[PDB]
Symmetry: C7
Subunit: 254 residues, 7 copies
């Protein structure tokens, strides 16, 4: 009879194998964490070391009860592949997560645009990243999607550039317009003077002459510099009698 | 002759194998559920443990009736692959379902936007999620599709931000306009005063000066704060003689 | 080789055995694969799922049979697997789309996101479901067109169901001249929706100034009715708004423009 | 090796046997694969399905034949599988699109979402179906263009069929000036569609104020007719709406604008 | 020592195999071309018959110098796969080329639209098709791309259909307008009279009443029938005092 | 002990194999280049012949130190596959490069449009093609991308066709307009007279009658013929009192 | 306790298995560094030499594990299967990065752009800062930092604004329908003749280009050095304005002929 002996041996092997798997796979895990390898990378790789051993164990254990060696590979292969398909997206997001943490194209707290979606990063989870839009919406984007696309970071550079486009009537003095605009941006102290300070006639529009003005400020200042400068342009041009034209039209009666 | 003995043995093995499969695969299932592993994950994995054993059983059983060991693998392989292709989408939705339950980017009852489709979540089924739009339509979105895309959640933050853009005639007093607007948002108690309260000249438009106003309120209040504040802006500006301009045009006459 | 006929009829026996095996195998395949099919159908498993799975049980046995049968005429065991493998794969590619539609068909039947007779929108295509066939779903548009959409395509996308909820919501946006009394406009609109008995009064009844438009003030009105009523409530309420505002001297403004002569 | 000719003609026998096997195999392939083909066609299985499946039965046998034939000249059994495998795979890739179109062709014939002669819209392309070939479908547009669409592309997408239903629905949207009598407008329109005998009276006959437009009030009119009638019912009804409204002094407004002068 | 004998045998086998490959693969090629099988199909399939034999030869030849039988399959497999990837697009274009030749959805000289690109087909090469646009641009489209998409053929039907849409002022006589238009298309002999001849009030536009006119002519005539008919519509309506309205607008003053 | 002998033999085999690989793979390379096979094709294929031999060498060499024959295949397989994935895009661009050189849908110096990007081709590198836009931008497009899409060639045909669309007021004499336009294109010698010379009333527009004019010139002339002809149309119509209408509108007053 | 002949008997294969792993790991280190130095010294790219050396390393660890696990009875096909799966798992996870890695090499190797050049990579323009292992960083004209994956970059078009030393401005000027075509051209030609930053040995187009709805449109095309392009446009444009105003050439507003009626 002595089938009983193989059946208990098969269980013994499974038990001994499961235990020797736990320890070898923790040993390797501590070893990589202590060598400053990423926690998730060390985790993922240790999990493989674990199941590699369970696999070898099942092969030997099922082997002793006559289950053939190719059959175990085939079956486990299928199982692995089934799990593989189910875990596929997550595995990809997992990896992206590691790379975002590892290379930090953005950091929690930075305003970014990830595929036409902008807001301030809260956190980068294992599989996805959370951000808060300027108006309090919480957006959750999968890590894989993020890393496949462009990452625009508004916060990384300390200094940024406003552009104004102002339209004035076709009969404005080009010199006066420029002078006034230049005075405005000269007197604004939040405008960096050691950088570009463009003030030019840019376009001959349908109903107006368009002047471009480009001026750098610190990120923090950018918003208010625009608003403040714009209000001055309004008041100054009104004072100087420079017209902001409405839509124009020549009409020919019959 | 004694082929009969292999044929009965083959059946015996199938029967004994099917029974020993049931129990080993339930044992492992209860073990996972009791260790607080997800019900669907524990189910999926147990189903594999089950068929792994049926596979080993069929190999040994068909083996004893002379069907070769590689033939059984090939055939079962093909079958598995056939089923694999058919079950592929669902398997992916199944997994997404687990992750939505597990990480709860949204919860039943939250207003969300899943790929340009907005409404309040009813439930997250095994393969798909159901929501009701603001006007009573029921939308059913596959879980996989949801988790591949962005998940905008309107309900998660307690505090949210209205923006108003008001256009006034080019001859309005910038100071007056701002003052009035500021008085309106100061006197509204549903507007959080410890947060942003922006009131600025924002744009020199074709026919109007455009002021932006940005003010935070609780999610619940957001809708009505907008409506209420807007109606006041109208009445106040009308009282103060601030003009909401119609489209403008300078026309220069001639005769042919 | 006239005289060398001991090893001749010797082959004949394998050739007949090979046929015998094919025949016996084909018969034992039919029965085992029907037995399994009845077993599933009787255990309340879907007819198509039970069919699909039984078909596999069938060909698995024909495969084993061909291997053994071709085997006894010397065709090697790996060759039969390779060849059948290729054949299977060829059929596999040809049947791929259908297999996917087949599965979607099962799931639409099984979970019924929609039911025959419901107005639905499947990927920007709306109409009333007629049936869900094995591979595709048929619907009739509001104007009598028959659209046939593959099941797989349906289940991959969103399914908007107009019919599932018993109660639905109309939105009206009405534009009135900038000199209208905000209070009067609201009052009139509120009277209209109060007096409409098909408008559910225990639900939202919004009437608000919504937008300061280029040429008009825009009021939003939002009011729930039963699905069946929704269409006619809109039409009826809209006609009243027209007649009432006209009576009250509330102007629906045309496009506006201030023109400055030069 | 002049004298060493015992082992020479010894190879000749395998070489002729190899050819004999190829020949016998090719012949036994032809017949077995025709036998199966007639069997399917006679059992009312599709001609193309029966063809495709028979072609596999054929080459399966040629494959077994080549293995045994090349085998008897020492070419090893795994080598033949590998080589034929590659060849098969090469052909596989080249034939892939067609194989998919072939299958779609079968399904279009088999389920007939459309039939030759029906006006259909296949992925934003409309016209009257001429035929469904093995790999693609041909249609003629309303203005005489011939479009050829691959079968696979057709079956992956929506199939809108204009011809399947016998009865279809016109919608008219008519804009009248803001000072029109809502009752009069409706009455006139209703009279027009009542007196049109090609408009089915047992079905919807909607005539409603639908939209308050920028320059006009818009009335919707919806009325069912037989497919054949649909075109002319629209034209005929529209012309009447014009003449009737003109007679009744109901104005079709031009674009409107209030203009406020200054200097 | 006698390794030298295996090494020469290995070369002998390679040489004998290469020669027996050439002939068997030409024999098969002539057999197919003579049985009216496509030149490219017969070529492609013969090339496989060739390398199948070189493969068997290398296996046996490398075998007699001790290189194991699975190793040769693995290595050649890899090589084949490397070439496979590089040749993948072309193989697909090759096949499309065959099918375009074989089924001729279009023929050289026909005006066609292949995926929103129109012009007159010059030729269908092995991998791609060349056409000349109406204004002398040469477009080269890959065969695979062509066969995956729609093929609109303007030249296949002998008879085609013009549509005119004419806008007239809201005060035009519907009967007069129709009559005039009908007279114009009746008197045009290049307009097929046994086919559709639609002349109807089609649309109540913002500034005009729009009449549709639909009339069939031969492909060759279509262009000039349109131009000629259009000029007559202009002259006739002007003569009859039917107005082609400019953009309209009702303006309501104040100040 | 005599493990040392296998270890040195293993190295000997690697060395002998590497050397016999170099020569066999150069021999094949010269053979192809001398038979007028493309330099890149001959290169790619020779590289395979090389590594095939290194593979056989490693199998035999690692074999003699006890590393099993299936293990070497598996490992090298994986390595090959790793390199395969990394080299995949380039391999595809490589092949496209060959085909663009080989079939020359365009040639350096031709103005072409490759997927909505136009300019003059500078060169076709191994993996990508460089062009200069009309305004001095250098665009670099991967070869694979190019060959997958349409290739519009402006330079290939020697003769090309201008189309002018001119709008004149609704009260213009159709005959006069045509006559003037015809005189203009008759007197232009850079307009080929043995080809199409269309001058027709084409469209009844909202504010104007639109005449189409279509006339062929040599590629080189096309640009300036358009400019020159257009300026004449302006001066001639002004002289003849033919009006280029501004936007039109009928306005109906109320109070 | 007594059955200890076959007990310590296993211990030897277990220590041998470890010995093999250790000896294999060490002989892997050196062989894979030896190959790495060999490539780097032969002027092979640092990343290519790295990637290939890493394969040489693990190939040896693989052979080592097979032999080591082999001596403790773990069968030779099992080790291949298991390592295969592991490799494949890692393969999938590393797939995107592997593709970006390769693109990184090719961008460095062929330099379609160089740090400091203004480029447009898939409708995104700015000046390149650096090309990292997996991605490229650029700064937009207004101070935004964009990070684009290398693979995405090489799959698409690369427009380089900085590579050519000479570039071409186009001006389109609209003048009233009653302007003298000759005068307009003459003035424009004088402007571009007198601008010294405009290359005179190259195209200098000034033509009537379009008969627009409300204006005649003249095109002007003129080459300058990359550095000059911006300011040449601005300067030339301002002159066109002042000159035309002086010469009484009108920049027309939108035009319309209006035909009055009196409804009743
Ligand atoms: C290889 C994993 C150890 C951490 C690497 C950190 C790299 C920083 C790149 C900026
Ligand atoms: C394989 C033969 C079965 C034919 C199916 C017919 C279906 C008819 C539906 C209209
Ligand atoms: C129109 C179909 C022609 C088919 C010819 C097949 C030859 C191979
Ligand atoms: C095997 C049949 C299960 C059906 C699921 C029902 C869910 C609504
Ligand atoms: C393997 C290094 C080659 C580098 C070639 C450089 C081409 C510009
Ligand atoms: C599929 C779920 C995996 C989660 C690991 C934390
Ligand atoms: C880690 C769990 C694997 C199966 C998920 C469905
Ligand atoms: C739960 C049913 C099994 C899947 C076969 C389609
Ligand atoms: C074919 C889908 C199977 C259903 C499992 C719940
Ligand atoms: C039922 C027919 C099988 C499909 C082969 C194309
Ligand atoms: C008809 C045989 C297939 C040929 C592929 C190019
Ligand atoms: C690629 C050619 C296939 C033709 C089958 C009729
Ligand atoms: C037929 C040539 C082989 C392809 C290598 C680019
Ligand atoms: C990539 C080379 C293929 C060329 C065939 C003529
Ligand atoms: C020639 C280098 C091989 C590819 C590794 C990135």
């Amino acid at each position: 009879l002595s089938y009983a002996v193989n059946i208990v041996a098969a269980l013994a092997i499974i038990i001994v194998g499961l235990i020797i798997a736990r320890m070898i796979s923790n040993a390797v895990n501590r070893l990589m964490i202590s060598r400053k390898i990423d926690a998730t990378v060390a985790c993922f790789l240790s999990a493989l070391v674990r199941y590699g051993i369970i696999a070898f164990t099942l092969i030997a254990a099922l082997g002793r009860v006559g289950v053939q060696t190719a059959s175990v590979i085939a079956v486990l292969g299928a199982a692995g592949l089934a799990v593989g398909l189910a875990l596929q997206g997550s595995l990809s997001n997992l990896a992206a997560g590691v790379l975002l943490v590892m290379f930090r194209p953005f950091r929690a707290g930075e305003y970014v645009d990830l595929g036409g979606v902008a807001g301030t990063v809260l956190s980068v989870q294992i599989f996805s990243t959370t951000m808060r839009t300027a108006d309090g919406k919480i957006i959750v984007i999968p890590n894989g999607k993020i890393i496949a696309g462009n990452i625009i970071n508004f916060s990384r550079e300390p200094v940024r550039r406003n552009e104004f486009i102002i339209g004035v009537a076709y009969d404005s003095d080009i010199d006066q317009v420029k002078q006034i605009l230049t005075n405005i941006i000269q007197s604004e102290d939040r405008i960096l003077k050691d950088r570009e300070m463009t003030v030019r006639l840019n376009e001959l529009g349908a109903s107006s002459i368009n002047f471009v003005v480009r001026v750098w400020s610190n990120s923090g200042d950018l918003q208010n510099v625009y608003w403040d400068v714009l209000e001055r342009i309004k008041r100054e041009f009104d004072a100087a009698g420079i017209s902001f034209p409405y839509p124009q039209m020549d009409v020919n009666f019959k």
